[PDB]
Amino acid sequence: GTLLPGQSPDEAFARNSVVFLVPGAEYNWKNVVIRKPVWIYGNGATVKTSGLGPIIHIMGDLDNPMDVRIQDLTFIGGDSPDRLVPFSAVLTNQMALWCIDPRITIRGCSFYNFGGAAIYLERSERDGQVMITDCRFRGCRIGIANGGSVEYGLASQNNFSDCQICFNVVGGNWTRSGNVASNCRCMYLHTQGMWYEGAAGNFNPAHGSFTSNTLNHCDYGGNLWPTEFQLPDRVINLAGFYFDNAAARLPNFSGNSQWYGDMKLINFLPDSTFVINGGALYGGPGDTGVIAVATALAAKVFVIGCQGNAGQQIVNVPAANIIPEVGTRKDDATQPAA
């Protein structure tokens, strides 16, 4: 199972349970199809592409115990992004890994300059143990997009730099821990009518775990991507952490650092509360790194065990729910805007 540059990756994956790339070599792949579980040992190779993606389309089989596994592999989606081009349906095609019904492990890989999601995971029908760790993302529209009913995955110890949206979140119950983002407009996005919902749609969404993450310089002092983001049927204004869905609950949120990590809690299920727990909230001067909740749900939001500076604004959360005192608190019913 040794796959040379120029040989058909499709043939090699069909013929072998495990494939080893030539160490450090350069590949050029386009619309590869994986139909049964295969392990790839990338050996520090690089996979380039051109034209409409994805680079690999992975047809899953959740009954089969053997996962698809990709280790130690670089994927390049092309040159540096034009970050001003509006996102579109045709650009959603520009993926590294499009995975349906995924039982998959992605470890120690790098993803550079994808026009859409570097990694997209969807479910063919509504109802895996997915793991994405130690990966690097640079210059990508979206880092990892999990569609509805892709649940209970783990994305941890990954580094995101210069990505518009790190986690395009739909499917529920993922653990996202120990991840670093800098100069990314959005680390966490969840709302209705997203891209990359997949065949199960926007079902049992979000409500997972977001711990020990850093989202720095989202809205100020490094990020280059636009705030305004085109969904399929409306335009929104992203934030480092953006949540707008009255029919969904937020994830558990503890141990995270926000240095210009602006946050907008626009709407969530009324039978819930939310805590910004054990966090570091630094912002200012001016309206930079602002944290804001919908006035109608502010009594259900708390800021507990947080540290911060005077310049960090907290908008609409009542004073009684901020223990201990952190930043500067105010009421402004114009915030947060969608």
Tokens encoding 235: 């335009």
Q: How far apart are CA 26 and CA 65, in angstroms?
A: 31
Select the residue interacting with a copy of itself from 10, 30, 36, 46 (CB under 8 A): 46
Q: Does 307 bind a copy of itself (CB under 8 A)?
A: yes
DSSP state, residue 205: B
Select the residue interacting with a copy of itself from 205, 279, 283, 336 (CB under 8 A): 279
Q: State the binding partner of 206 from Cl ion, a copy of itself, none, CB within 5 to 8 A by kind.
A: Cl ion
Cβ atoms of 83 and 117 closer than 8 Å: no
* β pairing state of 235-237 and 228-230: antiparallel
Q: How far is the CB of 159 from a copy of itself (least distance, A)?
A: 4
DSSP state, residue 6: T
Hey, CA dihedral for 75, 65, 132, 109, is it positive or negative?
negative
Q: How far is the CB of 235 from a copy of itself (least distance, A)?
A: 26
Tokens encoding 271: 């039978």
Q: How far is the CB of 251 from a copy of itself (least distance, A)?
A: 7
Q: How far apart are CA 253 and CA 281, in angstroms?
A: 13
How many residues sit in the footprint of a copy of itself (CB under 8 A)? 85
Select the residue interacting with Cl ion from 170, 206, 218, 275 (CB under 5 A): 206
**Cβ nearer to a copy of itself, comparing 232 with 270:** 270
Stretch that binds Cl ion, among 123-131, 142-150, 207-215, 319-327 (CB under 5 A): 207-215
Tokens encoding 253: 């949120």
Stretch that binds a copy of itself, among 90-98, 192-200, 211-219, 328-336 (CB under 8 A): 211-219
Distance set, CA 61 to CA 118, 133, 152, 200 (Å): 21, 22, 17, 16
Report which of 216, 303, 305 is spatially closest to residue 261, judged by C-alpha positions: 216
Name the residue with tokens 């909230």.
281
Q: Does 106 bind a copy of itself (CB under 8 A)?
A: no
Q: How far is the CB of 234 from a copy of itself (least distance, A)?
A: 28
Select the residue interacting with Cl ion from 54, 208, 283, 289 (CB under 5 A): 208
Q: Does 310 bind a copy of itself (CB under 8 A)?
A: yes
CA angle 285, 251, 183 (to 5 degrees): 40
Select the residue interacting with a copy of itself from 140, 275, 293, 315 (CB under 8 A): 275
Q: How far is the CB of 127 from a copy of itself (least distance, A)?
A: 11
Stretch that binds a copy of itself, among 52-60, 88-96, 303-311, 330-338 (CB under 8 A): 303-311
